[PDB]
Short mmCIF file of C-alpha atoms and ligand atoms in Angstrom, two decimals:
data_model
loop_
_atom_site.label_atom_id
_atom_site.label_comp_id
_atom_site.label_asym_id
_atom_site.label_seq_id
_atom_site.Cartn_x
_atom_site.Cartn_y
_atom_site.Cartn_z
CA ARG A 1460 148.16 104.76 74.35
CA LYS A 1461 146.82 108.10 75.30
CA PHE A 1462 143.19 107.44 74.85
CA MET A 1463 143.20 104.47 77.36
CA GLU A 1464 144.84 106.75 80.06
CA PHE A 1465 141.81 108.46 80.56
CA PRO A 1466 143.71 110.72 82.48
CA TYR A 1467 141.22 113.26 84.02
CA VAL A 1468 138.64 110.88 85.71
CA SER A 1469 138.75 108.60 88.96
CA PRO A 1470 140.57 105.25 89.08
CA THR A 1471 137.14 103.22 88.82
CA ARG A 1472 135.65 105.43 86.06
CA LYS A 1473 139.03 104.69 84.11
CA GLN A 1474 138.88 101.21 84.93
CA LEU A 1475 135.11 101.05 83.83
CA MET A 1476 136.11 102.43 80.12
CA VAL A 1477 139.38 100.30 79.81
CA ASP A 1478 137.43 97.22 80.55
CA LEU A 1479 134.63 98.00 78.39
CA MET A 1480 136.91 99.03 75.31
CA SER A 1481 139.05 96.00 75.63
CA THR A 1482 136.16 93.56 76.00
CA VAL A 1483 134.54 95.34 72.70
CA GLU A 1484 137.95 95.36 71.01
CA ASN A 1485 138.88 91.69 71.83
CA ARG A 1486 135.31 90.43 71.28
CA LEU A 1487 135.05 91.88 67.84
CA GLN A 1488 138.81 91.57 67.03
CA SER A 1489 137.94 89.35 63.76
CA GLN A 1490 135.33 92.06 62.50
CA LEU A 1491 137.09 95.29 63.16
CA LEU A 1492 139.48 97.14 60.72
CA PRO A 1493 142.53 98.88 62.38
CA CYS A 1494 141.89 102.49 63.64
CA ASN A 1495 142.55 105.02 61.01
CA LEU A 1496 142.20 108.50 62.72
CA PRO A 1497 145.03 110.94 61.93
CA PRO A 1498 147.25 111.92 65.00
CA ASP A 1499 145.60 115.22 65.35
CA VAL A 1500 142.14 113.49 65.62
CA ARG A 1501 143.03 110.76 68.11
CA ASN A 1502 144.00 113.59 70.29
CA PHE A 1503 143.32 117.33 70.21
CA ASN A 1504 142.99 120.36 72.58
CA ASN A 1505 141.79 124.04 72.72
CA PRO A 1506 144.60 126.02 71.73
CA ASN A 1507 144.21 127.94 74.92
CA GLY A 1508 145.06 124.92 76.96
CA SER A 1509 141.69 124.61 78.74
CA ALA A 1510 139.86 121.57 76.79
CA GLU A 1511 141.44 118.44 75.57
CA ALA A 1512 140.26 115.52 74.14
CA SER A 1513 140.67 111.77 72.72
CA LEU A 1514 138.88 109.69 69.99
CA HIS A 1515 138.97 106.01 69.02
CA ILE A 1516 137.11 104.74 66.28
CA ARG A 1517 137.21 101.21 64.63
CA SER A 1518 135.21 100.43 61.49
CA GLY A 1519 133.58 96.89 61.05
CA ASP A 1520 134.65 95.09 57.97
CA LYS A 1521 132.71 94.39 54.76
CA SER A 1522 130.87 91.34 55.79
CA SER A 1523 130.51 92.40 59.40
CA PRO A 1524 127.13 93.76 61.19
CA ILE A 1525 129.51 96.24 62.74
CA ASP A 1526 129.45 99.81 61.13
CA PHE A 1527 131.81 101.56 63.80
CA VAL A 1528 132.42 101.66 67.61
CA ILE A 1529 133.83 104.87 69.06
CA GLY A 1530 135.20 105.71 72.35
CA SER A 1531 135.93 109.54 73.48
CA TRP A 1532 136.94 111.20 76.70
CA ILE A 1533 136.38 114.94 76.89
CA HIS A 1534 137.97 117.16 79.39
CA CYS A 1535 136.92 121.00 79.52
CA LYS A 1536 137.81 123.41 82.44
CA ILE A 1537 134.78 125.67 82.83
CA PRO A 1538 136.09 129.24 83.79
CA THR A 1539 133.38 129.33 86.68
CA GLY A 1540 135.53 126.85 88.83
CA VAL A 1541 133.66 123.56 87.80
CA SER A 1542 135.49 121.12 85.25
CA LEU A 1543 133.42 118.90 82.89
CA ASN A 1544 134.63 115.17 82.18
CA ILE A 1545 132.81 112.96 79.54
CA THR A 1546 133.73 109.41 78.83
CA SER A 1547 131.76 107.20 76.23
CA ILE A 1548 131.64 104.23 74.27
CA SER A 1549 129.22 103.45 71.45
CA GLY A 1550 128.66 100.68 69.33
CA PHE A 1551 126.62 101.17 65.76
CA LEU A 1552 125.30 98.32 63.69
CA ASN A 1553 124.69 98.56 59.84
CA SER A 1554 121.58 97.58 58.05
CA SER A 1555 122.75 94.12 57.46
CA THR A 1556 121.08 93.78 60.76
CA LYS A 1557 118.03 95.07 62.71
CA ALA A 1558 119.39 94.63 66.22
CA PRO A 1559 119.87 97.52 68.83
CA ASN A 1560 122.88 99.76 69.16
CA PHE A 1561 125.10 100.31 72.32
CA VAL A 1562 125.62 103.45 74.40
CA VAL A 1563 127.35 104.19 77.54
CA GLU A 1564 128.02 107.53 78.68
CA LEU A 1565 129.20 109.09 82.05
CA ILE A 1566 128.98 112.87 82.38
CA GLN A 1567 130.42 114.89 85.06
CA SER A 1568 130.74 118.28 86.48
CA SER A 1569 130.30 117.88 90.32
CA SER A 1570 132.53 115.75 92.54
CA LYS A 1571 129.77 113.76 93.88
CA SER A 1572 127.16 113.95 90.91
CA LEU A 1573 127.27 112.42 87.57
CA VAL A 1574 125.11 111.47 84.79
CA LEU A 1575 124.81 107.80 83.48
CA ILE A 1576 123.52 106.91 80.25
CA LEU A 1577 123.62 103.28 79.64
CA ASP A 1578 121.28 101.53 76.85
CA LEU A 1579 120.75 99.63 73.82
CA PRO A 1580 119.00 101.96 71.40
CA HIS A 1581 116.24 100.43 69.23
CA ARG A 1582 116.53 100.42 65.53
CA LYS A 1583 112.77 99.76 64.87
CA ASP A 1584 109.62 101.74 65.64
CA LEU A 1585 108.83 99.60 68.85
CA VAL A 1586 105.06 100.32 68.53
CA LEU A 1587 104.80 99.12 64.89
CA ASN A 1588 107.08 96.21 66.01
CA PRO A 1589 106.11 94.62 69.39
CA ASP A 1590 107.83 91.35 68.40
CA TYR A 1591 111.21 93.62 68.34
CA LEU A 1592 110.21 95.07 71.86
CA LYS A 1593 109.93 91.40 73.00
CA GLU A 1594 113.07 89.97 71.75
CA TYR A 1595 115.30 92.83 72.42
CA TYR A 1596 114.02 94.14 75.63
CA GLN A 1597 111.45 91.81 77.60
CA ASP A 1598 113.07 88.43 77.01
CA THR A 1599 116.28 90.33 78.04
CA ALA A 1600 115.41 91.86 81.59
CA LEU A 1601 117.59 94.75 80.54
CA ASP A 1602 114.89 96.64 82.68
CA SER A 1603 116.17 95.34 85.81
CA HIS A 1604 119.27 97.18 85.82
CA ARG A 1605 117.52 100.58 85.33
CA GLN A 1606 115.00 99.70 88.40
CA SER A 1607 118.09 98.34 90.37
CA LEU A 1608 120.11 101.41 90.19
CA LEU A 1609 116.86 103.30 90.82
CA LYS A 1610 116.56 101.82 94.16
CA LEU A 1611 119.70 103.51 95.28
CA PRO A 1612 118.81 106.65 97.51
CA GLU A 1613 121.54 108.54 95.67
CA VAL A 1614 120.06 107.79 92.12
CA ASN A 1615 117.23 109.78 90.34
CA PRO A 1616 116.03 109.68 86.73
CA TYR A 1617 117.86 112.22 84.37
CA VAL A 1618 115.57 113.54 81.68
CA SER A 1619 117.20 115.02 78.81
CA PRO A 1620 116.70 118.81 77.81
CA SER A 1621 116.47 117.21 74.15
CA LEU A 1622 113.05 115.78 73.34
CA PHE A 1623 114.97 114.18 70.13
CA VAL A 1624 117.19 112.49 72.94
CA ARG A 1625 114.40 111.09 75.32
CA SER A 1626 112.75 109.53 72.10
CA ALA A 1627 115.93 107.85 70.65
CA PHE A 1628 116.50 105.87 73.89
CA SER A 1629 114.81 102.57 74.46
CA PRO A 1630 112.01 101.96 77.11
CA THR A 1631 114.60 100.43 79.20
CA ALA A 1632 117.28 102.80 78.99
CA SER A 1633 119.09 103.64 82.18
CA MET A 1634 119.16 107.48 82.43
CA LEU A 1635 120.48 108.21 85.72
CA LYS A 1636 121.66 111.01 87.87
CA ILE A 1637 123.76 110.26 90.74
CA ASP A 1638 124.75 112.17 93.84
CA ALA A 1639 125.47 112.45 97.49
CA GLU A 1640 127.62 113.63 99.98
CA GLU A 1641 131.09 112.13 100.08
CA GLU A 1642 132.68 111.16 96.61
CA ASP A 1643 133.64 107.83 98.33
CA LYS A 1644 129.89 107.19 98.15
CA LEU A 1645 130.08 108.15 94.36
CA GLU A 1646 132.88 105.70 94.01
CA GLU A 1647 131.10 102.96 95.71
CA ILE A 1648 128.28 103.45 93.25
CA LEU A 1649 130.45 103.51 90.30
CA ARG A 1650 132.37 100.16 91.58
CA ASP A 1651 129.49 98.49 92.88
CA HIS A 1652 126.45 99.10 90.81
CA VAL A 1653 127.52 101.02 87.46
CA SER A 1654 130.52 98.98 86.34
CA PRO A 1655 128.73 95.68 86.76
CA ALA A 1656 125.61 97.13 85.06
CA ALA A 1657 127.52 98.67 82.03
CA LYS A 1658 129.68 95.36 81.60
CA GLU A 1659 126.47 93.16 81.54
CA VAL A 1660 124.52 95.52 79.21
CA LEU A 1661 127.48 95.16 76.82
CA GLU A 1662 127.48 91.17 76.91
CA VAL A 1663 124.00 91.35 75.87
CA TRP A 1664 124.78 93.51 73.00
CA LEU A 1665 127.70 91.48 72.26
CA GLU A 1666 125.80 88.23 72.49
CA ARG A 1667 122.26 89.19 71.42
CA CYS A 1668 122.67 91.99 68.95
CA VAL A 1669 126.09 91.59 67.17
CA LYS A 1670 125.82 87.76 67.15
CA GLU A 1671 122.72 86.77 65.54
CA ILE A 1672 115.84 85.36 59.77
CA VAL A 1673 118.03 87.39 57.36
CA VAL A 1674 117.40 91.01 56.49
CA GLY A 1675 115.11 91.61 53.53
CA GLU A 1676 114.96 94.49 51.14
CA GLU A 1677 112.53 97.07 52.51
CA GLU A 1678 113.44 96.45 55.94
CA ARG A 1679 117.11 97.17 54.99
CA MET A 1680 116.23 100.44 53.43
CA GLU A 1681 114.04 101.57 56.56
CA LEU A 1682 117.07 100.88 58.91
CA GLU A 1683 119.41 103.24 56.80
CA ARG A 1684 116.91 106.15 56.50
CA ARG A 1685 116.11 105.80 60.27
CA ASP A 1686 119.80 105.33 61.31
CA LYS A 1687 121.02 108.19 59.43
CA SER A 1688 118.19 110.39 60.42
CA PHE A 1689 119.46 109.47 63.91
CA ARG A 1690 123.03 110.38 63.26
CA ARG A 1691 122.72 113.30 61.30
CA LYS A 1692 120.34 115.26 63.74
CA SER A 1693 122.30 113.85 66.85
CA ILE A 1694 125.58 115.25 65.42
CA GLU A 1695 124.03 118.74 64.42
CA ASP A 1696 122.59 119.31 67.86
CA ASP A 1697 125.46 118.16 70.12
CA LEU A 1698 128.58 118.67 68.17
CA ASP A 1699 128.19 121.49 66.04
CA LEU A 1700 127.63 123.95 68.96
CA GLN A 1701 129.44 122.46 71.92
CA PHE A 1702 132.72 121.65 69.94
CA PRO A 1703 133.30 125.03 68.32
CA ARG A 1704 132.95 126.27 71.69
CA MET A 1705 134.88 123.91 73.84
CA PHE A 1706 137.81 123.44 71.31
CA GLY A 1707 137.75 126.60 69.07
CA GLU A 1708 136.91 126.54 65.35
CA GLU A 1709 139.91 125.06 63.44
CA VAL A 1710 140.19 121.78 65.45
CA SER A 1711 136.32 121.52 65.54
CA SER A 1712 136.37 121.70 61.80
CA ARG A 1713 138.86 118.84 61.75
CA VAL A 1714 137.20 116.60 64.36
CA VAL A 1715 133.56 116.92 63.38
CA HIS A 1716 134.57 116.28 59.66
CA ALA A 1717 136.15 113.03 60.87
CA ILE A 1718 133.09 112.07 63.25
CA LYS A 1719 130.82 113.09 60.39
CA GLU A 1720 132.86 110.72 58.27
CA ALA A 1721 133.02 108.11 60.55
CA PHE A 1722 129.46 108.08 61.14
CA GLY A 1723 128.24 108.15 57.43
CA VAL A 1724 126.54 111.74 57.58
CA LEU A 1725 126.96 114.30 54.69
CA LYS B 135 75.37 107.16 84.29
CA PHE B 136 78.90 107.70 82.55
CA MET B 137 78.77 111.06 83.44
CA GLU B 138 78.25 110.51 87.15
CA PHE B 139 81.57 109.32 87.73
CA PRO B 140 80.02 107.87 90.99
CA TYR B 141 83.04 106.55 92.86
CA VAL B 142 85.70 109.14 92.46
CA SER B 143 85.80 112.60 94.64
CA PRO B 144 83.84 115.46 93.61
CA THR B 145 86.91 117.56 91.99
CA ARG B 146 87.76 114.23 90.08
CA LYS B 147 84.30 114.24 88.79
CA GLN B 148 84.36 118.23 87.86
CA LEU B 149 87.60 117.39 85.92
CA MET B 150 86.21 114.60 83.85
CA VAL B 151 82.98 116.09 83.17
CA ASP B 152 84.70 119.52 82.03
CA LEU B 153 87.11 117.51 79.73
CA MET B 154 84.45 115.32 78.03
CA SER B 155 82.00 117.98 77.62
CA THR B 156 84.64 120.27 75.92
CA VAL B 157 85.53 117.32 73.54
CA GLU B 158 81.68 116.89 72.79
CA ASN B 159 81.16 120.46 72.38
CA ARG B 160 84.18 121.16 70.14
CA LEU B 161 83.82 118.11 68.01
CA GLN B 162 79.96 118.24 68.36
CA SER B 163 79.33 117.77 64.25
CA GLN B 164 82.30 115.47 63.82
CA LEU B 165 80.95 112.51 66.20
CA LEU B 166 78.29 110.07 65.39
CA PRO B 167 75.79 109.58 68.23
CA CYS B 168 76.39 106.78 70.79
CA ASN B 169 75.69 103.47 69.51
CA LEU B 170 76.48 100.76 72.33
CA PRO B 171 73.97 98.43 73.65
CA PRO B 172 73.12 99.46 76.90
CA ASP B 173 74.60 96.57 78.77
CA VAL B 174 77.66 97.82 77.33
CA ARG B 175 77.33 101.44 78.32
CA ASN B 176 77.17 100.08 81.96
CA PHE B 177 77.89 96.63 83.35
CA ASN B 178 79.05 94.98 86.65
CA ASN B 179 80.38 91.60 87.92
CA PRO B 180 77.40 89.69 89.20
CA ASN B 181 78.24 90.47 92.69
CA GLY B 182 78.90 94.21 93.54
CA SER B 183 82.74 93.72 93.46
CA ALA B 184 83.12 95.64 89.98
CA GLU B 185 81.16 98.44 88.01
CA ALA B 186 82.08 100.18 84.85
CA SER B 187 80.59 102.82 82.37
CA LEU B 188 81.76 103.42 78.66
CA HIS B 189 80.93 106.07 76.11
CA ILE B 190 82.20 105.79 72.61
CA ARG B 191 81.48 108.37 69.85
CA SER B 192 82.74 107.43 66.41
CA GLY B 193 83.69 110.27 63.94
CA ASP B 194 82.07 110.27 60.71
CA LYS B 195 83.90 109.00 57.43
CA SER B 196 84.94 112.54 56.54
CA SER B 197 86.20 114.34 59.79
CA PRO B 198 89.76 113.73 61.06
CA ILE B 199 88.31 111.70 64.07
CA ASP B 200 88.27 107.88 64.15
CA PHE B 201 86.61 107.76 67.72
CA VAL B 202 86.54 109.40 71.11
CA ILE B 203 86.39 107.04 74.26
CA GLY B 204 85.42 107.77 77.76
CA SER B 205 85.43 105.57 80.72
CA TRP B 206 85.39 105.14 84.49
CA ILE B 207 86.06 101.74 86.43
CA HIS B 208 85.77 100.45 89.98
CA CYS B 209 86.54 97.11 91.60
CA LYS B 210 86.38 95.49 95.24
CA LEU B 211 90.34 100.57 92.47
CA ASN B 212 89.20 103.84 90.56
CA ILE B 213 90.00 104.34 86.77
CA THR B 214 88.78 107.46 84.85
CA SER B 215 90.07 108.04 81.39
CA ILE B 216 89.38 109.99 78.38
CA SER B 217 91.40 108.93 75.02
CA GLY B 218 91.05 110.60 71.53
CA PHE B 219 91.81 108.68 68.44
CA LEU B 220 92.35 110.40 64.97
CA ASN B 221 91.87 108.36 61.63
CA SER B 222 94.21 108.12 58.59
CA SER B 223 93.09 111.11 57.09
CA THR B 224 95.79 113.26 59.03
CA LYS B 225 99.08 112.53 60.69
CA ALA B 226 98.37 114.40 63.91
CA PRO B 227 98.70 113.06 67.56
CA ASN B 228 96.16 111.37 69.69
CA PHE B 229 94.97 112.53 72.94
CA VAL B 230 94.96 110.52 76.14
CA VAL B 231 94.08 111.50 79.82
CA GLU B 232 93.99 108.93 82.63
CA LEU B 233 93.74 108.89 86.39
CA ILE B 234 94.28 105.88 88.27
CA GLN B 235 93.96 105.56 92.06
CA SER B 236 94.14 102.93 94.68
CA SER B 237 94.51 105.08 98.06
CA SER B 238 92.68 108.42 98.54
CA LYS B 239 95.87 110.45 98.82
CA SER B 240 98.25 108.69 96.32
CA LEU B 241 97.18 108.74 92.57
CA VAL B 242 98.84 108.10 89.20
CA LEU B 243 98.00 110.42 86.26
CA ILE B 244 98.84 109.91 82.65
CA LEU B 245 98.45 112.79 80.22
CA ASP B 246 99.99 113.09 76.74
CA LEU B 247 99.37 113.46 72.78
CA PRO B 248 100.85 110.18 71.70
CA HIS B 249 102.90 110.47 68.45
CA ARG B 250 101.50 108.65 65.23
CA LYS B 251 104.90 108.35 63.47
CA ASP B 252 108.13 107.45 64.37
CA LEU B 253 109.86 110.36 66.02
CA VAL B 254 113.65 109.49 65.01
CA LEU B 255 112.75 108.92 61.33
CA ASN B 256 110.38 112.21 61.46
CA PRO B 257 112.25 114.94 63.90
CA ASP B 258 110.12 117.39 61.76
CA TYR B 259 107.02 115.63 63.20
CA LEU B 260 108.80 115.78 66.73
CA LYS B 261 109.41 119.66 66.24
CA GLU B 262 105.88 120.45 64.90
CA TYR B 263 103.81 119.01 67.59
CA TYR B 264 105.98 118.86 70.45
CA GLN B 265 108.67 121.54 70.79
CA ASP B 266 106.79 124.33 69.16
CA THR B 267 103.73 123.53 71.36
CA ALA B 268 105.45 123.84 74.84
CA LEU B 269 103.94 120.52 75.86
CA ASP B 270 106.82 119.49 78.08
CA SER B 271 106.32 122.55 80.35
CA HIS B 272 103.37 120.94 81.62
CA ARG B 273 105.28 117.77 83.04
CA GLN B 274 108.18 119.98 84.19
CA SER B 275 105.61 122.20 86.00
CA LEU B 276 103.75 119.41 87.63
CA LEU B 277 106.87 117.67 88.82
CA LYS B 278 108.20 120.92 90.62
CA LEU B 279 105.71 119.82 93.14
CA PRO B 280 107.17 117.98 96.19
CA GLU B 281 104.14 115.54 96.05
CA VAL B 282 104.65 114.46 92.43
CA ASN B 283 107.21 111.95 91.02
CA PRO B 284 107.78 110.24 87.98
CA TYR B 285 105.56 107.20 87.24
CA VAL B 286 107.06 104.39 85.22
CA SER B 287 104.78 101.99 83.52
CA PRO B 288 105.60 98.28 84.31
CA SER B 289 104.78 97.60 80.71
CA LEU B 290 107.63 98.27 78.21
CA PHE B 291 105.03 98.73 75.35
CA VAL B 292 103.17 101.80 77.04
CA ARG B 293 106.28 103.24 78.03
CA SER B 294 107.24 103.04 74.24
CA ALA B 295 103.79 104.50 73.16
CA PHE B 296 103.88 107.77 74.92
CA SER B 297 105.52 111.01 73.45
CA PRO B 298 108.72 112.41 75.21
CA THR B 299 106.57 115.11 76.81
CA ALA B 300 103.95 112.82 78.23
CA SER B 301 103.28 113.62 81.79
CA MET B 302 103.19 110.22 83.73
CA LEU B 303 103.27 110.72 87.29
CA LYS B 304 102.84 109.64 90.67
CA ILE B 305 100.86 111.87 93.30
CA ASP B 306 101.61 111.25 96.95
CA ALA B 307 100.18 113.65 99.52
CA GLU B 308 100.05 113.42 103.14
CA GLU B 309 96.40 114.31 103.54
CA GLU B 310 93.78 113.74 100.63
CA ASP B 311 92.60 117.41 101.44
CA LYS B 312 95.88 118.29 99.92
CA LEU B 313 95.50 115.86 96.80
CA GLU B 314 92.28 118.00 95.88
CA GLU B 315 94.02 120.94 96.08
CA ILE B 316 97.07 119.68 93.70
CA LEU B 317 94.02 118.05 91.42
CA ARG B 318 91.95 121.39 91.29
CA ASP B 319 95.07 123.64 90.69
CA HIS B 320 97.75 121.92 88.70
CA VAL B 321 96.41 118.72 87.31
CA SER B 322 92.85 120.21 85.89
CA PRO B 323 94.45 123.22 84.02
CA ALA B 324 97.32 121.03 82.45
CA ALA B 325 94.76 118.46 81.45
CA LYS B 326 92.75 121.21 79.46
CA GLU B 327 95.68 123.08 78.13
CA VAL B 328 96.74 119.74 76.77
CA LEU B 329 93.30 119.00 75.29
CA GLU B 330 93.20 122.37 73.93
CA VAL B 331 96.44 121.79 72.09
CA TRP B 332 94.79 118.51 70.75
CA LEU B 333 91.62 120.21 69.64
CA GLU B 334 92.98 123.59 68.35
CA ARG B 335 95.45 121.42 66.49
CA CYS B 336 94.05 123.24 63.35
CA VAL B 337 98.57 115.18 53.29
CA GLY B 338 98.15 111.79 51.47
CA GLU B 339 97.80 108.02 51.04
CA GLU B 340 100.85 105.81 51.41
CA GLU B 341 101.72 107.92 54.37
CA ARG B 342 98.39 106.61 55.30
CA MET B 343 98.89 102.60 55.12
CA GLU B 344 101.87 103.45 57.49
CA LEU B 345 99.63 105.22 59.95
CA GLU B 346 97.18 102.31 59.44
CA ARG B 347 99.07 99.26 60.57
CA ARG B 348 101.02 101.30 63.03
CA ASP B 349 97.62 102.51 64.74
CA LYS B 350 96.41 99.17 64.45
CA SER B 351 99.30 97.32 65.78
CA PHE B 352 99.18 99.71 68.88
CA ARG B 353 95.49 99.24 69.14
CA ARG B 354 95.55 95.66 69.21
CA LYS B 355 98.66 95.26 71.59
CA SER B 356 97.26 97.84 74.05
CA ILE B 357 93.71 95.74 74.43
CA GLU B 358 95.43 92.20 75.13
CA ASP B 359 97.54 94.10 77.71
CA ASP B 360 94.15 95.07 79.31
CA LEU B 361 91.02 93.14 78.32
CA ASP B 362 92.20 89.73 77.37
CA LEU B 363 93.54 89.00 80.99
CA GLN B 364 92.35 91.94 83.30
CA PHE B 365 88.76 92.20 82.36
CA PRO B 366 87.59 88.45 82.58
CA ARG B 367 89.22 88.24 86.07
CA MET B 368 86.99 91.16 87.12
CA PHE B 369 83.65 91.13 85.67
CA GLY B 370 83.64 87.35 85.01
CA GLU B 371 84.31 85.56 81.54
CA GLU B 372 80.95 86.27 80.17
CA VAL B 373 80.35 89.93 80.34
CA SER B 374 84.02 90.74 79.35
CA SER B 375 83.29 88.81 76.06
CA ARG B 376 80.73 91.43 74.66
CA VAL B 377 82.42 94.45 76.00
CA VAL B 378 85.66 93.09 74.37
CA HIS B 379 83.69 92.72 71.39
CA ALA B 380 82.37 96.45 71.42
CA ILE B 381 85.96 97.86 72.41
CA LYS B 382 87.67 95.67 69.49
CA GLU B 383 84.91 96.67 67.19
CA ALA B 384 85.27 100.33 68.07
CA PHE B 385 89.08 100.11 67.80
CA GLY B 386 88.97 98.23 64.67
CA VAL B 387 90.51 94.90 65.31
NA1 NA C 824 116.37 106.50 94.06
NA1 NA C 825 108.19 116.25 92.59
#
């Protein structure tokens, strides 16, 4: 299984991703459809041999609160020596449910410096819905992970170039930049702090978001328009310019269309 | 007495007077006179422990302004703050500036135009008011300074309520001389550039009932957070009763 090999990243980074995906796949095994991506979407590369990638999408079934779950690793050798590695898993719920989504993402281009994003993005306006802030974020101590990771001297806040991106993450989101010195210290951070944190945030999404009133009429619609506004804008700003470049045009066309199709975006 | 800011440094007084006078000079015709009983403009705890001044100027029924609130607070702590609140007639962002301080060389600053509709639902709102206005350049710039560091609110609610360009910052200088240097030269310009974007920010009804209960939900929450707990244990159960009345009446709860 080429996806699950995570071939360009460190053993701990790999292990974190394998464990996260198995847990999701095993735990949602009754609700997930078999993955459906054509062989040339599950894996692809830039024809010139300098970018390669892998995608794993499982849609939820008809009575399931899951829309889909997606994992990916991207490797892209930058011409200016440095080499970018992205690994991410994201869980998306549908409007039969108001609960938060899941995101974890590790982005790296230095050997001892790495961006972590780990969150449970909200699907309701948190200022209109203090009750929602309370059940999903306060009563949850989701914040203790952010603060704890922050206590490390190698860890600083990461703030997205995109205003849209800052605004779509929850108030407890861990958006962190790690770096120091030896890469052995990085590995120790990954292994001793980032994995436990990621695994636990996944447990809360699985136990508290997925497993669950019953969502009425006008609330169901609000969720659809908000969710589809998010995906639509999130794709255009990150996919359409990055993939064309990284991968070249014909392959970007194929994958973006499949990603768009998985996401529900026209 | 409000405009004296008696417990903050000269440069703190200078800022807050400049800002409030700007507000009051630009809006001049859209604000009704102050109408607080004088025991609410000014009050203290029985013993000298705590004083506070408030200044509330309602806009009239036909301007875009719901109200403007000014205040300074001191206990044993120094807080000075100027909020601007718009009514339904307009979808535009509010204004908040706030300086919290409990040292003499370290100081929290919040400075923002809080959004009045959901930023993920409305990316068009986002762009109009936040990207196109360069508002983030302020926090970027302040943060370049070796003394300034992200502040993060302990309250998950207040984190929620701030826009993504919000300058929420902790300033920690070696000597308080060097704090006033930053205060006079970085904070002050940024606060006025930001206020300027709020004022020189120059259509209909069910868009408006949304603005309404959203505005009310923030207002209600943002006031328990503060004045139901913190005020009675600072000024005494009784004083806090009438000023929470005034505040709650002005805020519309
Ligand atoms: Na740190
Ligand atoms: Na700084």
